[PDB]
Amino acid sequence: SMSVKKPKRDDSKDLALCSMILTEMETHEDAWPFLLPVNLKLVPGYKKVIKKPMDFSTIREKLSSGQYPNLETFALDVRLVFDNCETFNEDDSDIGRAGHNMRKYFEKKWTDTFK
């Protein structure tokens, strides 16, 4: 509350460490469904169904331009990528399986880096 604060967690490396996590996600072999925005002209249903499209390139541009106020807003956009994928793709498809794998990969990195 006013003039009463928990001790200051060091957040000065968060930007660098999110960039590293994101590099590791970008270079994973199963990243290919996620690298670029889904082409809303060419994928029927995507525009109407997925209210907030997100992809790694968009996260990378937001990160690089100071559009994440903190590491939680960054994790929200990464998870959005996987939540979108599960919304649109059957579990038993290559893209569906890609999405589960990447989410697992991300969550381990996240826990090991920050928790």
User: Reduced to 3 states, what is the DSSP secondary structure of residue 83?
Assistant: helix
Determine the Cα–Cα distance for residues 55 and 77; give it in Å rounded to an integer: 8
> Looking at residue 52, which CATH number applies to its domain?
1.20.920.10
Determine the Cα–Cα distance for residues 69 and 91; give it in Å rounded to an integer: 33
Determine the Cα–Cα distance for residues 59 and 78; give it in Å rounded to an integer: 8
Give the structural domain span for 90: 1-115
**Helix ranges restricted to H, 1-115:** 14-27, 46-49, 56-64, 71-88, 94-114
Number of domains in the chain: 1
Determine the Cα–Cα distance for residues 82 and 55; give it in Å rounded to an integer: 9
CA–CA–CA angle 42, 63, 5 (5° rounding): 135
Resolution of the coordinates, Å:
1.7
